[PDB]
Design a protein around this nucleic acid. Structure first.
Ligand code: ZN
Lengths: 98, 209, 704, 62, 636
RNA sequence: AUCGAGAGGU
DNA sequence: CACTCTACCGATAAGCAGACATACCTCTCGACCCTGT
């Protein structure tokens, strides 16, 4: 979250919403100073966030690897449930569908 | 292979599968129910009932072949947690209605031991089942060996060869599937024959105890 | 003269010796002998040798063969008829020659001799054949020189090129999964077989080392060239840091090139010099072997004690049925198979078998765990698992885990079955809000109405899953459920949290000027109760929680499960049909697992799984999806299915670890498991249940 | 010299035996003692450093 | 049957308003010993050419100290699981732990953020309160003293908020003496109050190495920046196993400690007794000598030395009877090291210092280890180097909290920030150059950690070290016989410790070095010296299996019968066994050639001919000529 | 005679 | 015919301490403290 300090005493600024002026202000609890910079009092936090399937018969370029990740998904170009084969990229990086 | 996921309520498919498995269980029980009723499919049940299930239509009945008072039934009365008073009321309804009173009373959810104490208040046996324990039938499994039960005139001819009582015979507990799916009172050996192709003639006459 | 027939493997325990096999091989290599040599060997025989094989030739006169020597070593009259050798009164007709079939042939010969005449004849035959063979070799001599361990620099460069080719997949082994590890093991086995074929060209190594045994091949290749892999991630005995932040730094300090994939791809051998890093890795592997071996000797001892404290009273009576000493209980009706085949086994009426089955089950385990074999480790572990199952158990990992088969496509289109396999996961995964979040913002809005809160949660574009603004829908239903529940105490401000709503209009971007990202897909969940910022802050920390965690239901998922992965398996292990396949197709079988929702009574691990998947008719109801456990088939099917699933798994594990067949002992043990009303293991609580159900009054056993 | 990480090579070990007069690979012809006849397989013979353990047989027997 | 002991007498001076305190056992060949005395008095006075020293005779039994390995106490130990940084130290009072945590004692539930608190004198004090108490003035200043540079936005804004809330708890943490008093109240209201003014405790038990409080604060900064940087993932938690984080304590600290325990018992008795006399004689009557003497002995005999940390428990595995079966069993019994308890396995820091191949097999596998051949443990350097360090540019850490620390890198000696330096690379170089011109202690280790911007110099006791050849001097000094000292001094060799090594690029051998001279800074003397005394002599040791060479270097080497003793009349051991005609091996390992000792190999050369002999030699049986065993071989 | 500990071949 | 209010059985975790080092067998090397008549 945003961090601010009292200009006068270098202290933590506490957010305070003024109901009279209908604006957000930041005032230090310890002493006596207040102001507004961007009105963006945030509780910002980074909420923290797999290969289950595998193929055994997909054709490869030359060696017949038969390794790929198959799963049903929807493409951004054509809507609908369609098998999306994540190829092992033997000679092409584009993922091919059935 | 666009999966035609059933937009209908899962409760409808659940009730259909449960009733189908119950009707097949009663067919195995040796009761006379019209095979046309058992032949009802999911699409027919959906056409008749719709996609929203109704807990009002639950009547199932059956009859015995050579007996005079043996007629067991199924009522899917349970859809939420109930009390002993609900079972008592349905039992009083079927008591003032007719004499077929003995029936299965399946429950959609967990059962209470107070109900297990209360079944003794009724002068007959019942079978508390689940609405999920009748979603996949048994005896139609490629790993279940066919179970045959003998009558008390040729089973009684086990003291002739083995000369052994049922206590020393290999036991089976009255809580497994094929013991709570046919109906087995103590005093009849289940002459299990292993139809598993890898298993040889390992008949054990595993009786209930 | 009575313990020749083994009650463990079924064959003669008098197996072949090293010197005996070596002498027999070096004697069969030279079919014809001289005169003085032939006469000197027969001396150790039993009877004379009137007729010679080769009467007259160009330069040789009377010349005998090893076949007549074996004949005079054979008993007087015998008729084997084993489809490869014929004998009629100490007259051998034909004797095939192979690489290792001679041992099996002579084993069949001695078994036929034992079953025909008796044990004394076999003892005399062995006592007449051993010194003869010892003398035969002694004249010839056998030794190994340095030429036998020839490197063959051309083949060495070939092996080095093969190593360079095979080191490419080393980068993607410890990162993706264990299937690549098994493929790596297969490739290493193939390269080892190639090196063994390139190594067995000598005369002494081929005659002194077995060929069909994998352990001999490993111990021969590891000491001549291409030392095997010695650093793996499957062993829990050592810490993962030793291979995560030690070996890479060692290779970077000591080696010039990066070579990050140099963990078990060491090029040195035992015949050549070994690098210090290679010696360090080898010492680490040796220490791991030693600790595993010590545990392997320590714990199976306790296991044998536990399984022996209970199998000491199972003895057959005169009636032929298996009886118990306490309460005169019956376990089995007859010990011995009653199939179409018939054999007069050594098992009699007054003979104990429970102790015999105990020892015959404790023996295979010992071997599997004394050796450090990782292939046998999995096999040993499954056996250990079946030996520890208990009548009372709570939320074990095995019970919740359930296999999930499918139905073959009627159309038969390529990948149609696979299409179904990927699809079913999508109804059993548990995607949650958390996975999809990437940031978290809170802005102040200018101004009765008073709502200054716009989370802009900012989920990533994972539209592959496809979740709709229908996220809003699960959030709305969850907050409605939370607000409707008034029986809970000290609940959040649900009356003010009803104002949460998602709106993606491509214009909500109000992030800080730093970064210049300008992303999309916001989230406008806001709840207001007052104007002071402190109440806004504390409220935010509480409700934040429900969303990224609780909103599992939002996308592609059911709760009450963790995930679903597809695993290929051999169908011949679970079912035996007349039109079975080669068990090599890329068929994928799912493995659901249940998420602490197995808290349900006994096991509803099934009851929970059949319920979620109710919107997929591809699931087959014959050849059922069986839970990978022992106690759950007791509730799904009858006791017969549990008996079958136990005996099949024990037989498979025994065949994987050993070669002797013990089907009768496995059946006896599985029946001993089914006595107290429920499938119970061999432990303290199991022994208490056995003593309470069968009324066993034996304080001495529990005191020991 | 046979220091542990700088051992003499196999090519060197064997081109020494050759110069000595014995067979390059370390094996020698042996004639059987009891009969006098040459024996078919050359045997490997050389000088090794052995050790005796303190665990003698006599104490064990009881 | 008596203890070779030595009497210890101190000058006491009891005044009311040179006694004998005990007897320490002496170690054969130690300075105290009369056998070290002067030149060899008489070979004939019993000595065996083979014997070297290192043992104590306690009651007619020789006994030896297996060294014990303990954790370094001169560095900060970050632990990942509870997210704690620590300044462990021996005096219990001194330990200070700053530990992040979701505190549910007074704070909110898991929905809240974690907060940083300290643990000093069994108290729970917030961090920002403390900073203020030690003289930080404003919140900005403090932030500078914990200069997380990295912006891991999530962690910083949590720590800040939680810290500020635990501070408001105290009425005026920011201004006045209220923060200090808050602390005072807390320390005093604990179970066993120190009873010393806060202000003396802040100087006395909080960071005794530093002098001023302000300075003490800057250090609380380094201490937090680490817990923080770790959480963010830049730096890694410490491995208990790696040697760089361990110290080996030999026979000095172990003797110091047991006497300290005992001296105490005596002082306690003396006082109690003196009271009786004082209430209502020669000093000797009062102080009992027996106390130290009897006590030390009971330890040596029953082998139960005191626990290093717990104060009323006895560790076992510190003394062990020397084994005299062969000459080598003795040598490998005096070089063993132990770790009381991934520790059972080799590690890559055990390189050059402990042997990777040999270890006991049994319960102690891995835990007891054997030193390498060329490894020397260090001893406390009495000289103090701070002044010298200042001579090479190093500037004092400024007392004021206000100052920027623009680009200096911290220099820390044995764990105390003592200075700030500018261009670390240059500083380290000069310092090293001095070490090699013999103007600074030889065993000092200078490590420049580029990542954390610090130079850490250590000069404590217990650090395993080994020698290693250096390149440029090798190029022009050797060329233009050598005793070791001359070599060390003129800098053509040097002792480089485990941490410093990590920086070094050392070539494996002379040949390798010759191929590419520029890229390598040091060259190892010989790869054979990486093994123990009982393993560096085995021919083709890298040509056999690990288990086989382990067995041969652990049990077959000890049980081998040969060469027992030069004077055999002065010794009356229970079993001894001597070869009639012992022999040396034909092959020469370098190690035996250098050591120039012959008791290393115990056996005879036997002409073997692998072959099968009438099946008496199957399955590991041995068949032998009956006429070489009668013409004398293997007779004992 | 007894106890405990340590070091061992399996 | 709806309401509230506390006595009673569950299920719960939830906390609390322990409990454990396969087995046959060999050898050597030390073993309680304070006080009164
Ligand atoms: Zn201020």
């Amino acid at each position: 979250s945003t961090m601010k300090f009292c200009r006068e005493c270098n202290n933590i600024l506490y957010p305070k919403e003024d109901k009279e002026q209908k604006i957000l202000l930041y005032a230090c609890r310890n002493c006596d100073h207040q102001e507004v910079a961007d009105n963006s009092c945030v509780y910002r936090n980074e909420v923290h966030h797999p290969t289950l399937p595998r193929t055994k018969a997909v054709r490869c370029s030359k060696c017949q690897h038969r390794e790929a990740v198959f799963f049903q998904a929807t493409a951004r170009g054509e809507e609908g449930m369609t098998l999306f084969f994540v190829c092992c990229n033997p000679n092409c990086g584009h993922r091919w569908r059935e | 292979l666009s999966k035609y996921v059933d937009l209908s309520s899962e409760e409808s498919h659940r009730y259909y599968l449960a009733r189908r498995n119950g009707l097949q269980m009663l067919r195995d029980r040796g009761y006379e129910v019209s095979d046309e009723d058992i032949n009802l499919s999911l699409h027919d049940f959906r056409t008749v009932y719709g996609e929203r299930p109704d807990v009002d239509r639950l009547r199932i009945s059956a009859l015995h072949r050579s007996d005079s008072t043996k007629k067991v039934k199924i009522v899917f009365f349970g859809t939420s947690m109930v009390k002993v008073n609900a079972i008592r009321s349905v039992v009083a309804d079927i008591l003032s209605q007719e004499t077929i009173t003995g029936l299965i009373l399946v429950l959609q959810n967990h059962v209470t031991n107070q109900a297990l104490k209360a079944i003794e208040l009724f002068s007959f046996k019942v079978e508390i089942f689940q609405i999920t324990d009748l979603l996949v039938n048994i005896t139609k499994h490629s790993l279940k060996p066919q179970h045959q039960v003998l009558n008390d005139e040729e089973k009684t001819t086990l003291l002739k060869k083995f000369s052994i009582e049922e206590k020393q015979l290999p036991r089976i507990s009255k809580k497994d599937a094929i013991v709570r799916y046919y109906g087995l009172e103590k005093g009849q050996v289940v002459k299990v024959n292993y139809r598993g192709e890898l298993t040889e003639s390992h008949v054990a006459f595993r009786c209930v105890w | 003269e009575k313990q020749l027939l083994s009650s463990h493997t079924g064959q003669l325990i008098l197996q072949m010796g090293s010197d005996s096999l070596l002498s027999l091989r070096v004697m069969l290599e030279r079919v014809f002998l001289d005169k003085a040599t032939a006469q000197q060997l027969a001396m150790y025989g039993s009877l004379s040798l009137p007729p010679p094989a080769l009467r007259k030739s160009s330069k040789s006169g009377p010349a005998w063969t090893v076949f007549q020597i074996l004949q005079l070593a054979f008993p007087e009259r015998l008729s084997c008829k084993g489809d490869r050798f014929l004998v009629d009164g100490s007259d051998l007709l034909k004797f095939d020659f192979g690489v290792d079939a001679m041992g099996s042939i002579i084993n069949e010969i001695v078994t036929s001799i034992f079953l025909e005449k008796g044990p004394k004849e076999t003892l005399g035959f062995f006592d007449s054949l051993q010194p003869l063979l010892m003398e035969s070799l002694f004249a010839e001599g056998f030794s190994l020189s340095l030429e036998d361990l020839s490197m063959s620099r051309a083949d060495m460069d070939v092996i080095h090129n093969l190593i360079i080719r095979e080191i490419s997949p080393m980068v993607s082994r410890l990162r993706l999964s264990y299937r690549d590890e098994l493929q790596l093991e297969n490739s290493i086995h193939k390269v080892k077989e190639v090196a063994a074929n390139f190594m067995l060209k000598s005369y002494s190594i081929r005659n002194l080392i077995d060929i069909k045994s994998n352990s001999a091949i490993t111990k021969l290749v590891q000491q001549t060239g291409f030392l095997g892999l010695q650093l793996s991630d499957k062993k829990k005995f050592y810490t993962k840091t030793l291979v995560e932040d030690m070996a890479i730094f060692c290779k970077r300090k000591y080696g010039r090139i990066s070579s990050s994939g140099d963990f078990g791809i060491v090029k040195g051998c035992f015949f050549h010099g070994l690098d210090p890093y290679e010696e360090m890795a080898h010492s680490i592997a040796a220490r791991e072997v030693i600790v595993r071996s010590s545990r392997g000797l320590a714990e199976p001892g306790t296991l044998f004690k536990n399984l022996m404290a209970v199998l000491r009273d199972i003895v057959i009576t005169n009636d032929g049925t298996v009886r118990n000493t306490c309460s005169n209980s019956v376990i089995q009706f007859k010990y011995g198979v009653d199939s179409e085949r018939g054999h007069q086994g050594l098992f009699e009426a007054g003979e104990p078998v429970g102790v015999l089955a105990a020892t015959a089950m404790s023996n295979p385990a010992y071997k599997a765990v004394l050796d450090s074999s990782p292939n046998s480790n999995s096999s040993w572990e499954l056996m250990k698992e079946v030996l520890l199952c208990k009548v009372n158990f709570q939320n074990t990992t095995n019970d919740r885990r359930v296999i999930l088969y499918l139905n073959e496509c009627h159309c038969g289109k390529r990948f149609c079955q696979e299409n179904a396999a990927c699809t079913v996961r999508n109804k059993l995964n548990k995607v949650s809000l958390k996975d999809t979040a990437v940031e978290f913002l809170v802005e102040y809005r200018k101004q009765g109405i008073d709502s200054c809160l716009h989370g802009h949660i900012h989920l990533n574009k994972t539209l592959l899953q496809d979740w709709n603004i229908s996220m809003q829908d699960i959030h709305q239903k969850c907050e409605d459920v939370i607000n409707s529940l008034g029986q809970k105490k000290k609940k959040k401000a649900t009356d003010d949290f009803k104002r949460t709503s998602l709106s993606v209009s491509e214009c909500c971007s109000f992030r800080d000027p730093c970064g210049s990202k300008g992303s999309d897909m916001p989230c406008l969940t806001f709840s207001y109760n007052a104007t002071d910022p402190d109440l806004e802050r504390t409220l935010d920390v509480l409700c934040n929680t429900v969303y990224p965690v609780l909103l599992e239901i939002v996308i592609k998922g059911d709760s009450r499960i963790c995930s679903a992965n597809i695993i290929w398996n051999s169908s011949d292990m679970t079912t035996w049909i007349r039109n079975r396949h080669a068990s090599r197709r890329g068929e994928w079988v799912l493995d659901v697992t249940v998420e602490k929702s197995a808290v349900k009574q006994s096991g509803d691990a099934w009851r929970v799984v059949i319920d979620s998947c109710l919107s997929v008719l591809h699931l087959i109801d014959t050849k059922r999806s069986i839970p990978y456990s022992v106690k759950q088939v007791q509730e799904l099917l009858g006791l017969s299915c549990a008996f079958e699933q136990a005996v099949q798994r024990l037989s498979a594990s025994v065949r994987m670890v050993s070669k002797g067949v013990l089907k009768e002992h496995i059946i006896l043990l599985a029946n001993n498991m089914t006595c107290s009303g429920t499938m119970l293991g061999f432990n303290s609580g199991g022994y208490k249940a056995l003593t309470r159900s069968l009324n066993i009054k034996a304080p001495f056993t529990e005191a020991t | 010299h046979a220091t542990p990480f700088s051992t003499p090579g196999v090519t060197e070990i064997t081109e020494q035996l050759h110069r000595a007069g014995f067979s390059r690979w370390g094996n020698e012809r042996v004639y059987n003692g009891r009969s006098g006849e040459m024996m078919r397989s050359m045997i490997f013979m050389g000088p090794t450093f052995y050790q005796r353990l303190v665990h003698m047989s006599e104490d064990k027997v009881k | 049957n008596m203890t070779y002991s030595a009497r210890i007498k101190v000058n006491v001076q009891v005044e009311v308003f040179d006694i004998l305190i005990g007897s320490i056992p002496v170690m054969v060949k130690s300075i105290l010993c009369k056998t070290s005395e002067k030149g060899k008095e008489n070979c004939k006075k019993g000595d065996c050419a083979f014997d070297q020293g290192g043992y104590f005779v306690i009651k007619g039994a020789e006994k030896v100290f297996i060294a014990q390995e303990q954790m370094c106490t001169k560095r900060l130990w970050i632990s990942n699981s509870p997210w704690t940084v620590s300044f462990r130290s021996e005096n219990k009072r001194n330990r200070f732990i700053v530990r992040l945590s979701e505190n549910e004692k007074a704070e909110d539930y898991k929905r809240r953020e974690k907060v940083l608190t300290v643990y000093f004198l069994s108290t729970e004090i917030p961090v920002w309160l403390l900073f203020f108490a030690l003289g930080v003035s404003s919140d900005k200043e403090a932030m500078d003293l914990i200069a997380f540079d990295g912006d891991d936005a999530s962690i910083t804004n949590s720590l800040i908020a939680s810290i500020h809330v635990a501070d408001a708890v105290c009425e005026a943490f920011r201004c006045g003496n209220n923060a200090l008093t808050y602390v005072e109240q807390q320390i005093k209201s604990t179970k066993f109050p120190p009873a010393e003014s806060v202000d003396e405790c802040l100087h006395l038990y909080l960071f005794p190495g530093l002098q001023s409080l302000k300075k003490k604060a800057r250090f609380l900064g380094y201490m937090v920046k680490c817990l923080l940087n770790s959480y963010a993932g830049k730096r890694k938690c410490e491995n208990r196993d790696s040697f760089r984080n361990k110290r080996i304590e030999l026979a000095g600290e172990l003797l110091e400690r047991e006497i300290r325990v005992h001296l105490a018992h005596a002082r306690r008795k003396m006082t109690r007794a003196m009271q009786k006399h004082l209430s209502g004689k020669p000093i000797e009557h009062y102080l009992d000598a027996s106390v130290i003497t009897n006590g030390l002995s009971r330890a040596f005999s029953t082998g139960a030395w005191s626990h290093p940390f717990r104060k009323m428990e006895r560790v076992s595995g510190v003394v062990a009877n020397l084994g005299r079966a062969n000459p080598l069993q003795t040598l490998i019994d005096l070089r063993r090291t132990r770790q009381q308890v991934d520790a059972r396995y080799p590690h890559p820091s055990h390189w050059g210092r402990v042997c990777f191949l040999s270890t006991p097999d049994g319960e102690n596998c891995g835990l007891v280890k054997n030193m390498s051949l060329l490894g020397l443990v260090s001893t406390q350097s009495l000289e103090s180097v701070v002044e010298k360090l200042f001579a090479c540019g190093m500037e004092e850490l400024m007392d004021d909290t206000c100052t920027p620390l623009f680009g200096k890198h911290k220099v820390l000696l044995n764990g105390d920030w003592v200075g700030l330096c500018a261009d670390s690379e240059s500083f380290v170089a000069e310092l090293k150059s001095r070490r090699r011109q013999s103007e600074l202690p030889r065993e000092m280790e200078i490590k420049r950690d580029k990542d954390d911007n610090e130079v850490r110099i250590f000069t404590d006791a217990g650090r395993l070290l080994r020698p290693l050849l250096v390149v440029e001097n090798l190029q022009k000094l050797k060329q233009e016989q050598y005793p070791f000292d001359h070599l060390l001094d003129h800098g053509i060799l040097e002792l480089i410790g485990i941490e410093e090594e990590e920086d070094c690029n050392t070539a494996w051998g002379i040949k390798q070095l010759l191929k590419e001279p520029k890229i390598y800074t040091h060259c190892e003397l010989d790869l054979s010296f990486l093994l123990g005394v009982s393993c560096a002599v085995v021919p083709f040791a890298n040509h056999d299996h690990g288990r086989r060479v382990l067995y041969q270097s652990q049990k077959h080497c000890q049980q081998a019968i040969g060469f027992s003793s030069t004077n055999p009349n002065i010794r009356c051991d229970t079993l001894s066994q001597q070869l009639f005609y012992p022999q040396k091996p034909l092959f020469k390992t370098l190690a035996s050639e250098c050591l120039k000792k012959e008791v290393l190999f115990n056996g005879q050369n036997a002409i073997v001919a692998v072959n099968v002999h009438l099946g008496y030699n199957q399955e590991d049986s041995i068949v032998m000529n009956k006429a070489s065993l009668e013409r004398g071989m293997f007779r004992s």
